[PDB]
């Protein structure tokens, strides 16, 4: 069934990012490979202000049909990887 589970930690930490904000109201006329942000589409479910990227898209190569998530561009794939905020401790 289920193993005893308290307050569990986050499991997309670095897969997020920031929705375009223009995107959202609709005046972003700059397609995913031109724009430098993420532009999920209707299919795909968008998070409160964000949206999770696809892990099978960040090979190149995905399956799922009804993919929920988002698949960013290659010169956004980096901003994943820096994980903008360092350890102070
Ligand atoms: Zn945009
Ligand atoms: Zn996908």
């Given at each position: 069934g289920?193993?005893?589970?308290?307050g569990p930690v986050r499991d997309?930490?670095?897969l997020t990012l920031e929705?375009?904000?223009?995107?959202?109201?609709?005046?972003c006329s700059r397609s995913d490979e031109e724009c430098k942000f993420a532009h999920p589409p209707k299919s795909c479910?968008?998070?409160?202000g964000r949206v999770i990227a696809c892990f099978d898209?960040?090979?190149?190569?995905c399956s799922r049909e009804?993919?929920?998530?988002?698949?960013?561009?290659?010169?956004?794939?980096?901003?994943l990887?820096?994980?903008?905020?360092?350890s102070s401790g």
């Open positions: 289920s193993s005893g589970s308290s997309t930490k670095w929705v375009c904000r223009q995107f959202q109201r609709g005046t479910q968008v998070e409160n898209s960040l090979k190149g190569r009804n993919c929920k998530y988002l698949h960013p561009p290659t010169h956004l794939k980096t901003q990887e820096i994980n903008s905020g360092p």
